[PDB]
Amino acid sequence: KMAKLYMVSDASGSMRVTVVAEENPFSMAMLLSEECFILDHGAAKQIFVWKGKDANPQERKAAMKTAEEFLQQMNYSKNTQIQVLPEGGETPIFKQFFKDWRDK
């Protein structure tokens, strides 16, 4: 199944959910420390919320809400696994979507 990467940010003056990569494998550089991201692999029962260390509280809350909205918007089941990852606390399964993950 093919995953999609979204950015959750209010850096534009309003809270926006935008597509940053249509298909995996993704590049690690796509994850910006100042924002939050949603990695949607809902067709394979998995969504990840990634929270940049420099993302603000509004963005962090919006990213959590957005993961839940995806279940309704894309008609994913209630049993969809949602993983919540702070920047630096990423799991091997999350890293697996990236062609060039380099640990800091």
Next chain:
Amino acid sequence: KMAKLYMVSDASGSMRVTVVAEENPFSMAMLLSEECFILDHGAAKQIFVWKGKDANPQERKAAMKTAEEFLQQMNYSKNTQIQVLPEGGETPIFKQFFKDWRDK
């Protein structure tokens, strides 16, 4: 460290976050299938969002947002682990807070 159990529900006509148990160990019967719950063990770096199989989309979104609000409200670090559990998909660590967990 001592955990606290909260209910996230709009069954009253408005979205409310209420205390259902001040201290662990909790009773499994406290988890109502029609609502969402937050198990706060933030002092030990762990928060759990539990989503009842019969909870509505508004409650599910509010519970996700609430876990993030707890970090700001209780001054927990950005590295606090947040586990998201659908009813029936509970982890051993979540079950460990209950004196009488009985799998269905």
